Design a protein around this ligand. Structure first.
Ligand SMILES: [Mg+2]
Ligand SMILES: [Mg+2]
Ligand SMILES: [Mg+2]
Ligand SMILES: [Mg+2]
Ligand SMILES: [Mg+2]
Lengths: 104, 84, 136, 177
RNA sequence: CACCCCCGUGCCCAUAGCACUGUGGAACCACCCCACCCCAUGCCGAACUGGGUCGUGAAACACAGCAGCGCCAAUGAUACUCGGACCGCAGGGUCCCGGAAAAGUCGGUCAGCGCGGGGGUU
RNA sequence: UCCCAAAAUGUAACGGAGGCGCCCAAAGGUCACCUCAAGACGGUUGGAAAUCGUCUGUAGAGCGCAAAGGUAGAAGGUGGCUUGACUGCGAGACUGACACGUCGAGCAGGGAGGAAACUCGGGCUUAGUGAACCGGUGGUACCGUGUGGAAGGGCCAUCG
């Protein structure tokens, strides 16, 4: 249950990896796909869906991922850690991954 | 041969050698590998540059300075605040 | 008297009364002035003394209970192990501890039943009254 | 096959009986649980398939065998052995088996008068009690093994037993008068 | 950190919690809606998961009230005690010097502090 | 293993209690998912418990065993795929008079799981053991009595 977020969130070994974390809010249709800094209580990049959804709501998949990947290079970011909230990595979120995995 | 018993009941020899506890403390310099805690379960859980062996042994990953964080029992952590 | 379920054996140590008020349950009490080990039989001896004196009714509060097990020397030796499970049960009494308290009896009636029970005890005692309301 | 007949007749009537602020604050039927607590005295490998196959014809669902809680008590009690048969019904499949009850189940019962109305599950729920097996539309003695029964639970979104009592009857349910 | 609010995510993980009570819907979020597939239920789209509105804000959530319960908790005093020095045949006890509780009482609390994105001051 | 053991470690007695001399081809690796005991009220064989349902619920359960520590953000419970229950090595510590014993990051060859970060050199840990000597077996081609082989030995592995 609420145990699934804390589960993946705990297995996201913060500073040992060195990398930055990539959060996602696909529980609703306003996916928040954020780049969050480990040490500092800071959020660096991020790409939503509320600000022009492009007709699509669940199909906006790659759109938010592409938006993010592009916003990452604008800051420099190349090393990442993806955190599938409670979302069983398959559809909506599996696309956002490849969308960013090919956009940098 | 008797109809009574094998080993005689009501004893009191038996005990075992045993060790344990904290090895390195808050404000000590550590080299990498240095064991800082010997324990049973997870009295103290690992932190920054602190590993955990098969037998819950807490050891240094990288050289520096031992730091203890006491959040309130159970939430106990040993960390290394790298000197450089 | 004895306890229903347990461990079998114990130890020994002493220092001033931990949990003994003054006026709980009863109107008049009997307090220890010396430390001791109250044998099951000494309490029973005190109870019967008081019960007889206060013929009918039943208003005796025995605030002490024998829970400590004591041991014994079979007849000789030392060339064996730890001993005698079933010797006697005891209540570790320290000065201040209310051992007994009475109700529905006069100052004079109580004065005596405690004066009698005192003669059966292995320590010096003092008879008391009310004005202790600590925590309830 | 019953959906709108739950709405149109029951749904507005409850706001016209009581008076809810919203169409959502009106009690609803959460789920229907069918349980076959056999075994104990019926410890057979043959009896396992028996009720399970019989249940597959009535609910149109494959039933689950709820194993024992590894309770090895004084009497005939042991490890996780097959002791109960469960099947859950919600939404589409729920109303298929609920309609089948009020029409063929409930009236076509030998020694029938009505079901227990008295305060059931205090927090707005119902737990129906069946005492035979030869009282169902797709169950006959021709293609079986022996004689038995079953137990059925009705889970509802009702806040109280008072609001639960109305919903069950207005849907079509017998109450002993 | 112009200011209000919301969705994410932190440090802090009960002075942050529960209960009771009230406000918020079509911005956001929630149920809801249908599902033949992707994918999924040792049975059941309950949950995961897909396509999407409407309908509602019921439930959930967020926010606000409140000191009934939790939680936090003094000052004083005592227990105990390092060191100094004694009493008693003993169980056991005392004095001087610092250290110092636990429980209880007074009382304090329905937190505080970041980063990003979304929507408002008609 | 706990207590004695005097809040570090250690500490004796024919002192107080209690276990071990194995087990698991998954009860290992990894990736997924799941969340307990109990009680109240309501119901088929039933009815003290059982299989079902809602309401309370740091855990009062479980962890192959003894107990202690630990633990639900799982070490508990379920499944897919697997063989790291790897070979060559060990920075640096723990612990012991020794001889033993413990933990271990990191490097190479090869792999397993996962999209991936990563994790994997048995098992939540703390018991399940036995120096050396003589010897059985598979590998190796170091020695091999004038030379070349061979017997015999050595060396890895492993059994008594
Ligand atoms: Mg307190
Ligand atoms: Mg001094
Ligand atoms: Mg002194
Ligand atoms: Mg003396
Ligand atoms: Mg003093």
């Amino acid at each position: 249950r609420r145990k699934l977020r804390t589960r993946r969130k705990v297995r996201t070994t913060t500073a040992a990896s060195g990398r930055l974390r990539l959060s996602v809010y696909r529980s609703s249709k306003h996916i928040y796909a954020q780049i969050i800094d480990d040490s500092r209580g800071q959020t660096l990049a991020a790409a939503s869906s509320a600000a022009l959804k492009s007709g699509n709501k669940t199909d906006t998949a790659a759109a938010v991922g592409k938006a993010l990947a592009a916003a990452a290079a604008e800051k420099g970011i190349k090393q990442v850690v993806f955190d599938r909230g409670s979302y069983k990595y398959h559809g909506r979120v599996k696309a956002l991954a490849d969308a960013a995995r090919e956009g940098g | 041969a008797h109809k009574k018993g094998v080993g005689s009941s009501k004893n009191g020899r038996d005990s075992n050698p045993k060790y344990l506890g904290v090895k390195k403390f808050g404000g000590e310099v550590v080299k990498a590998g240095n064991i800082l805690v010997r324990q049973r379960g997870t009295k103290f859980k690992a932190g920054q540059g602190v590993g955990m062996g098969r037998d819950h042994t807490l050891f240094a990953l990288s050289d520096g300075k031992v730091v203890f964080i006491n959040k309130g029992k159970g939430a106990r952590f040993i960390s290394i605040e790298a000197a450089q | 008297k004895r306890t229903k379920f347990r461990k079998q054996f114990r130890g020994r140590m002493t220092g001033d009364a931990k949990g003994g008020d003054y006026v709980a349950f009863g109107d008049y009490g009997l307090i220890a002035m010396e430390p001791a080990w109250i044998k099951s039989n000494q309490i029973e001896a005190c109870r019967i003394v008081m019960s007889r004196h206060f013929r009918r009714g039943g208003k005796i509060y025995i605030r002490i209970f024998p829970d400590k097990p004591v041991t014994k020397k079979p007849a000789e030796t030392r060339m064996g192990k730890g001993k005698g499970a079933v010797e006697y049960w005891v209540s570790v009494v320290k000065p201040g501890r209310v051992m007994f308290e009475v109700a529905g009896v006069t100052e004079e009636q109580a004065k005596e039943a405690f004066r009698l029970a005192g003669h059966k005890l292995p320590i010096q005692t003092k008879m008391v009254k009310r004005e202790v309301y600590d925590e309830a | 096959q019953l959906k709108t007949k739950y709405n149109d007749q029951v749904r507005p009537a409850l706001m016209q009986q009581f008076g809810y602020s919203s169409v959502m604050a009106v009690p609803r039927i959460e789920k229907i649980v069918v349980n076959e607590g056999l075994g104990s005295s019926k410890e057979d490998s043959k009896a396992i398939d028996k009720a399970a196959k019989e249940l597959a014809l009535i609910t149109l669902q494959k039933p689950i065998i709820t194993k024992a809680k590894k309770s090895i008590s004084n009497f005939k009690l042991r490890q996780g052995m097959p002791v109960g048969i469960k099947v859950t019904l919600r939404g589409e499949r729920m109303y298929v088996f609920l309609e089948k009850l009020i029409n063929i189940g409930l009236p076509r019962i030998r020694d029938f008068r009505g079901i227990n109305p008295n305060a059931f599950d205090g927090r707005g729920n119902y737990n129906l009690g069946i005492k035979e097996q030869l009282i169902f539309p797709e169950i006959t003695y021709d293609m079986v093994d022996k004689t038995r029964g079953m137990d059925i639970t009705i889970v509802t979104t009702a806040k109280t037993d008072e609001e639960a009592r109305a919903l069950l009857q207005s849907m079509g349910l017998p109450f002993r008068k």
